[model samples]
Target: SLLEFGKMILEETGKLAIPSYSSYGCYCGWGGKGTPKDATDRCCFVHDCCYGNLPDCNPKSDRYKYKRVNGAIVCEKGTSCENRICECDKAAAICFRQNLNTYSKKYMLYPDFLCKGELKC
Candidate 1:
């Protein structure tokens, strides 16, 4: 009985068993300190944004966002959305509530981009 208890104690103490864990790092699955966002989820994962497809190369990335112009996703860099609020870079700014129209606390909004491009009035 004593011998059996000793053996059980040793096993319970983890001297007979080893724990296994994967360190998902900044990429997610290579070999991290066992933290989050450390490695890639898959082995040797290769992609422009291997860790994660962010706005750009950075993980917490935020590049120049786009505004729905007419029927296309266009950025201030490319202005030309006929019939849309962002009719043109020139008009996008001059229009009323060009950027983001808002009322006290709450208000519906619309438009292309006034504060965008080189226009902000």
Candidate 2:
């Protein structure tokens, strides 16, 4: 399984986390910058860049949807620009798997330090 593979990457490489030198965060809430506090958070930063644009590439509504297939997450096929969005999500999924060591349940409640107050879809 990929979960097991992720563990192998950490055990063999001895590397702690993906390198990050910016003000990015994991699980972007709404709008603005974020702070990547660890390797898991840095993966979100990479995904943000993978989208790399607005409207057609917006993470809010343009990313691919997925479903559980044989106990594995699978990206559903999409039309037009959605193909690119699916690939972006694929890359992000792999990154998240690769850096699973730093995952923490507390991150779910992380406040939006970058955004003062506002909303976007």
Candidate 3:
């Protein structure tokens, strides 16, 4: 009961579950899908494109592979793919921050009609 209640609270605050690649607008949890919902979502779309097919650098990569420097994730010094991945993330982060207000609470819901595929959970 408590766990369910806790989940309810998180959902209400728009911080509950994660979505799959089928997600379109906002790219809130996983990868993006279809057209971007807005300029902010566009940022994520570009970031996804930037990463392309680098196995060592995708959304599912281990966070442990990165280093936390002064509370921010940093790519290893003097590298190509890692630096590119980090740059993509950094750019997306800045974009998200710049348009923070655009993210909506309804996006937290599953089976987002704005997206391409249905949510399993």
- Residue range 1-121, candidate 2, lDDT tens digits: 2232233234333432322211235443333354565676666665566566535554445545555566455657776566666665566556666766765655654556543333222
Candidate 2 Cα misplacement greater than 4 A, ranges = 1-27, 57-78, 114-121
**Could you tell which candidate, 1 or 2, scores higher by TM-score?**
2
TM-scores of the candidates are 0.17, 0.50, 0.53
Compared with the true structure, what per-residue lDDT tens digits does model 1 show for residues 19-108? 111112221223222221212211212221222322222322222233546634354442222212112222212221221232111111
C-alpha lDDT score of every prediction, in listed order: 0.23, 0.50, 0.49
- Clash count in backbone of candidate 1: 13
Which candidate do you rate higher for TM-score, 1 or 3?
A: 3
Distance from true position, residue 84, model 3, in Å?
0.9
Worst 10 residues of 2 by lDDT: 15-24
Best by lDDT: 2
Q: Which candidate should be chosen as best, given TM-score against the real structure?
A: 3
RMSD of 3: 9.2
